[PDB]
Amino acid sequence: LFDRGVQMLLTTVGAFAAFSLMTIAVGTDYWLYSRGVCKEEVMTHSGLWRTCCLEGNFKGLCKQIDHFPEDADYEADTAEYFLRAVRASSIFPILSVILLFMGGLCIAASEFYKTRHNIILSAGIFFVSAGLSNIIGIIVYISANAGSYSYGWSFYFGALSFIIAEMVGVLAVHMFIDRHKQLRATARA
Amino acid sequence: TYMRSAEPSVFVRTTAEGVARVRKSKGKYAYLLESTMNEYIEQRKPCDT
Numbered sequence: 001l002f003d004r005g006v007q008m009l010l011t012t013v014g015a016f017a018a019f020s021l022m023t024i025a026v027g028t029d030y031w032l033y034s035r036g037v038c039k040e041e042v043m044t045h046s047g048l049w050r051t052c053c054l055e056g057n058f059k060g061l062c063k064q065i066d067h068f069p070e071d072a073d074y075e076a077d078t079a080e081y082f083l084r085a086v087r088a089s090s091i092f093p094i095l096s097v098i099l100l101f102m103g104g105l106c107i108a109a110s111e112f113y114k115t116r117h118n119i120i121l122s123a124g125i126f127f128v129s130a131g132l133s134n135i136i137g138i139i140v141y142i143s144a145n146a147g148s149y150s151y152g153w154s155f156y157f158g159a160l161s162f163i164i165a166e167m168v169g170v171l172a173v174h175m176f177i178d179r180h181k182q183l184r185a186t187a188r189a
Numbered sequence: 190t191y192m193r194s195a196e197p198s199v200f201v202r203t204t205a206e207g208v209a210r211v212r213k214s215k216g217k218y219a220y221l222l223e224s225t226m227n228e229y230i231e232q233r234k235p236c237d238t
Contacts, residue, residue: 072213 004178011171015104015127018164021157022100022134026093029062030152032145039063045152048090048141087144092137093158099130100165107172117179124172127165134162212237 001007029047036044038053038061045054050062067088076084086092103126110119138159192199199218201207207220208230231238 074215074217 001174004175007171007175011168011175012104012107014164014168014171015100015107015123018127018130018161018168019097019100019104021161021164022093022097025154025158025161026090026097028154028157030154031141032149032155033152034149047152047154048093083140083144086140090137090141092133092140096130096133096137096161096165099126099133100161103127103130103168103172117176117183120172120179121176124169124176127169127172131162131165131169134158134165138162208238 026048029050029052030045031048032046032051034044034046035041036046036051038044038051038056039058042056043054044051044056046065047062050064052062053059065088067084103123106119106123106126110116110123113119138155141155201210201220204220204222204226207222211218211220227238
């Protein structure tokens with residue numbers, strides 16, 4: 001929004017904050033607060049891979065989510081199996097993590113070989129793609145969930161990471177425009 | 190002809206598990222039995238037949 005040194009710092013701190021928030025989101029088992037079984041029905045906190053029991057007889061033991069449960073799973077159509085494959089693999093959250101890391105690497109490497117103006121464009125594209133990946137992952141996770149409840153802080157950690165990623169992606173493109181604007185300015189002189 | 194050449198086997202040993210197999214498919218299996226027993230089980234809990 002102003003100058004270049006402050007914009008650098010704001011962009012890198014935003015990218016790092018988004019990366020940390022998403023790393024916590026995918027690496028923490030606090031995504032859903034719902035009644036269930038942690039091994040009768042009992043309030044438990046769920047995540048992406050494991051769900052630990054809460055206020056139960058045996059508190060604090062996580063078990064892997066039965067993504068493809070046995071005992072007459074009843075099967076499903078191709079679309080539903082596709083959805084469960086994405087939800088179990090959680091590729092879109094992981095793909096968002098990879099895109100955020102690639103964007104962070106690009107913005108960190110933008111200092112080296114400053115004459116390359118397309119590195120910042122690559123970082124902006126990576127961050128925006130990470131935001132889109134976040135949107136897809138959130139939609140897939142909620143759709144799998146709906147197959148009383150409330151969401152944990154790590155689900156809202158990822159939600160805030162998507163907002164930060166797009167805001168950081170916006171700054172990167174603004175950074176791309178200004179430096180290309182400078183090239184036009186120095187060409188006229 | 191289809192039931193005789195159906196894989197996996199669709200034949201049921203006893204009507205006790207014949208209704209059970211229907212309930213464990215969510216409508217992916219149909220059991221052929223006497224109408225009087227069909228009406229009786231239909232009137233039993235949990236009304237899933």
